[PDB]
Amino acid sequence: MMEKLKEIEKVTKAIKEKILNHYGYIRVITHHDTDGLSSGGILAKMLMRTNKLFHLTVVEHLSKEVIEKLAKENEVNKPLFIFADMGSGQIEEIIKHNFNAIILDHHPPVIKDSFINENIIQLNPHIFGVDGSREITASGVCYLVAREFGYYDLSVLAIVGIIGDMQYNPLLGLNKFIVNEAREYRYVKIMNDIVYNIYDVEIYKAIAYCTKPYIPDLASEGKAFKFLKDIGIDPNKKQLDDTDKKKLLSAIIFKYPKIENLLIDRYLIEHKVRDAFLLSEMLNAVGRNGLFAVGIGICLEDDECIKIGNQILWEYKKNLINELKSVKLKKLNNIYYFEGKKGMIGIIASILVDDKPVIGYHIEGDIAKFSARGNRDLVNRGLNLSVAMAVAKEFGGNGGGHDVASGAVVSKDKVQEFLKRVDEIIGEQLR
C-alpha cells in the first residue's frame, strides 16, 4: 500500500508542479453530487493556499456541448483546466480541443494513461489497478493531490465524498488509508453509533424522515413519537445513549428486522458540520436543488451557507418521505415495481429495496425508462441486475448496468411483458 502510493506519487508530484508553475487563469469544472462538491471544496482550498485565483464551475454532465463551450474560452488566455469527478469518460473530446488539462477522476478510463501528451495529466486510480467503484472517490483523488502540499486537514472532505458515493462499508484500499491518515492527524474520530444520532435533532424527527433505512411504519412524526414514548425514551432528546439504543433496537427489530443497517461507524470531522454523514446529506440536498455555489460555501465553512444547507436538507428530507409514501408499490413473484416521476426513480427504488429487487419506471415519449435496484444480500444469493435488465433487447429495447443497480429502456406498450420476463429471470438467479 505504501508501494501503490509511491507509484501514484509520481503522478501527484507532476500535478503539483504543473499547478505551481502555471500563472494564467485556472478553470475548475466539477460535478454537482456530494463527491463533486467535496472535490470542488478541496480544490478551492488547495488553490487559494498555493496563491492561485481560479474560476470554478459546477456542471451536471460533461457533454460534448459543454466541452465545446469552454474550448471557446481557450482561444485567448488558454487557461489550465482541472476537471474533477469527470473528464476520464470524455477524454477524447478534451484531447481533440488540445486543452491544457488535469483530470482527477475515478470513472473507468477510456485511455489508461496518466500522461497523455505534453499538456494533459490524468490521475485515475484504475490506471494503478485500484477499483474506483469501491476503493477511492473523486474527492479522495483530489485529496491525494492536496497532500503533496501537506494539506492533511482537507482529508475531512475526502471522507465526505466517500460517504456520498457509498464506499464507506466496507472501507477499502486508498479510502481506508485516507481515513487512517485523517485519524492519525486527528481530523476525524471514529465511533460506532446508531444512524439516528447523526442528525442532532429531536430523535422522533430523525426517525420520521430517515431513508437509510426507510421504515414505512415509523415514517411520520406521530408514529415515531408514539413508538419512542412506548419504549420509555424521551422523544425530544437529540442523542440516544446506550440504554436508549438497546431499548430502541430491541423494539424496532419487529418493524424492521435487519437492524444491522441501523448501526454505522460515525465520522466526527474537524469541520463546522461535525458529522460527516450529515454534511454528505446536506451537500446532496443542496446539489439536488441547484444551489451549487452554496454547496462550495458549506465546504468552506461559511456560516450562512451552512444555515441555508440545514434548511434545504430538511425540506429535501420531508419531500422525499412524501414522495415515498405516494409510491403505489406493485408486486410480481420475485420483484416489486412502480411507475413514478422522471427525477427520482432510481433514488426511490434504492430506498425501497428490502427483501426483493425494486424496479421503477417513468413514461417519457413512447419510451418507458426503468431503474432496477438490489442489495448486498440479494447479490450474495445470486442476483445480477445487468443480466436481467439486458433482456430489454428482446422487446426492442436496451438494458444493462451493475449486479446491484441497472437500467433499461423498452417501448411503452411492452412494459408489462418486459417486467414479466425480468421477474422470471431474477426468480431463476435466486434459486
Candidate residues 35, 135, 202, 244; the one interacting with Mn ion per rule CB under 5 A: 35
CA distance 100 to 18: 10
Q: Is 105 in the site for Mn ion (CB under 5 A)?
A: no
Candidate residues 1, 48, 191, 430; the one interacting with its own copies per rule CB under 8 A: 48
Q: Which stretch binds Mn ion (CB under 5 A): 65-73, 132-140, 321-329, 367-375?
A: 132-140
> Whose Cβ is closer to its own copies: residue 128's or residue 152's?
152
**What part of residues 158-217 is at the interface with its own copies (CB under 8 A)?**
none
Residue nearest Mn ion, CB atom distance: 35
Nearest to 38 by CA among 387, 283, 354: 283
Neighbouring CB atoms inside 10 A of 166's CB total 14
Q: Is 24 in the site for its own copies (CB under 8 A)?
A: no
Eight-class DSSP state of 235:
T
What, of Mn ion, its own copies, none, does residue 58 touch, CB below 5 to 8 Å by kind? Answer: its own copies
Q: Is 335 in the site for Mn ion (CB under 5 A)?
A: no
Q: Is 341 in the site for its own copies (CB under 8 A)?
A: no
CA distance 388 to 164: 27
Question: After what residue numbers is the chain broken, C–N > 2.5 angstroms?
Answer: none
Candidate residues 8, 15, 43, 47; the one interacting with its own copies per rule CB under 8 A: 47
Q: Is 51 in the site for its own copies (CB under 8 A)?
A: yes
Q: Cell 430489454 belongs to which residue?
A: 392
Q: Is 165 in the site for Mn ion (CB under 5 A)?
A: yes
Q: Give least dist CB 294 to its own copies, A.
A: 5
CA distance 97 to 65: 13
Question: How many Å is the Cα radius of gyration of the chain?
Answer: 23
CA distance 2 to 14: 18
Q: Is 45 in the site for its own copies (CB under 8 A)?
A: yes
Neighbouring CB atoms inside 10 A of 1's CB total 10
Eight-class DSSP state of 405:
E
Q: Is 244 in the site for Mn ion (CB under 5 A)?
A: no
- Residues contributing to the site for its own copies (CB under 8 A): 25, 45, 47-58, 69, 72-73, 76-77, 151, 153, 290-294, 296-297, 300-305, 308
